[model samples]
Target: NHHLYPDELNVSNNPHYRPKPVSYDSTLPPDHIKVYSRTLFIGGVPLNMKEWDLANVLKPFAEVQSVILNNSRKHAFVKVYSRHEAENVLQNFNKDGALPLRTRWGVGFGPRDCCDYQHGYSIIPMHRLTDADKKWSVSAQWGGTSGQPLVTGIVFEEPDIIV
Candidate 1:
């Protein structure tokens, strides 16, 4: 459905504004191990958000290199393949209420930290060669995962490799 859930929320008020989904091809679960200058802490996720879904959202923006789903804390860590990409997420969507989640830099197995006030703001090596992030609400969380196996974001109901 093009419509969203009643309780669903958003930050980037523009409905037309959205990200391009990635071609899914995952091989492993993330290691909640590394955090320095190339990882981001994505808060606002819930237990319902399957790991694959969340990865798709940020995959475009940061080249999502590593991942970790501490579903117990309502947060996740998505590190990019480059140092520059991590910093990019912070500056572009930093501050309160941008990602519909408070973004932060990773700090290992403990509570994630910040970038400015001792914030390390970071990642990827081009895992997802596109750029886009965020959504209206929980409805959009699993665009690439098993959550929404149907309703898709499209470009004229066409096929891939049109060239």
Candidate 2:
């Protein structure tokens, strides 16, 4: 039942609240800088929520010109009438930032960047140093110092990597 972040959003009754955006190159992100689309990117959309339901939820920030939802990605793009309107969501909606959900201006650059931003941790492949013993292991190949026994076999001989 933990669907919509806030069980109840200050949903709007604006006439434009239920409209969808114009379809055309709409999946693409905004420009790098100037002349970018006013569409704001939203993440963590509740899967059970309806497209229009999400729309009205965001309308209190400003008149939502239109919105497009993708439950497959649990994401949505909201188009506002002005830049100020889009910016207002950050400061107001997630007030003090509690992780109920979040958004950012623009679709973010290109397809690669979109993935980069969404799954930054997945960018580089984590190859293993060597097959590890099953007893215990460090998640990362290096520097993890993955904890375990209070003490280990003493070593006063030569040495190994400082790590």
Candidate 3:
């Protein structure tokens, strides 16, 4: 039978006995591939509310990319810059109790569906509009076509029109 070393055995006294410490990489992921849920759904908002007002209210928590409000349904969809910001809004607004306006993950279109990042600013893509529809397209509050100012921000101010 083979002999087994007991716990009391003085293995530490042996010259070759050295234990390697456990370690991990702890580095952050790259920006492009980082996962973020950039959309949020808010319910019970006032029917008379405007997109600008809603965007202003949410600006402190994160950069607002777009706001789609449905007055008849008493709800709105808000797209922010990153998932962390969206989580911050939910954590701060959704505290001990539900907020006056319920908040959660957005339904339907997400940030990628309606907005894109240009020059580090969120912008509505011109490609979303057809050649004939371009005439009716309104300028975005943050950025517009090639001639518009290159503002480093995002905010959808007209809820009546589709982005």
Give each model a TM-score.
Answer: 0.42, 0.43, 0.43
Cα lDDT tens digits, model 2, 29-147, are 33211122345778888788766776677778876655677888888876554445565775688676564467865442123332333322111111211234111122211112233
Error of 2 at 159 (Å): 64
Model 2 clash pairs are none
- Model 1 Cα lDDT, one tens digit per residue, 1-163: 2122223322357332224233322332232111234456788886678667666766555555446677788888764544456667777653555445667766421232322324562112222212221111113321221122322221110001100
RMSD of 2: 21.3
- The whole-model C-alpha lDDT of candidate 1 against the native structure comes to 0.42
Off by over 4 Å in 2: 1-33, 96-99, 108-163
Off by over 4 Å in 3: 1-35, 94-99, 107-163
> For model 1, what is the error of residue 73's alpha carbon versus the real structure, in angstroms, after optimal superposition?
1.2
- Which ranking of candidates, highest TM-score first? 2, 3, 1
Model 1 TM-score relative to the real fold: 0.42
Ranking by lDDT: 3, 2, 1
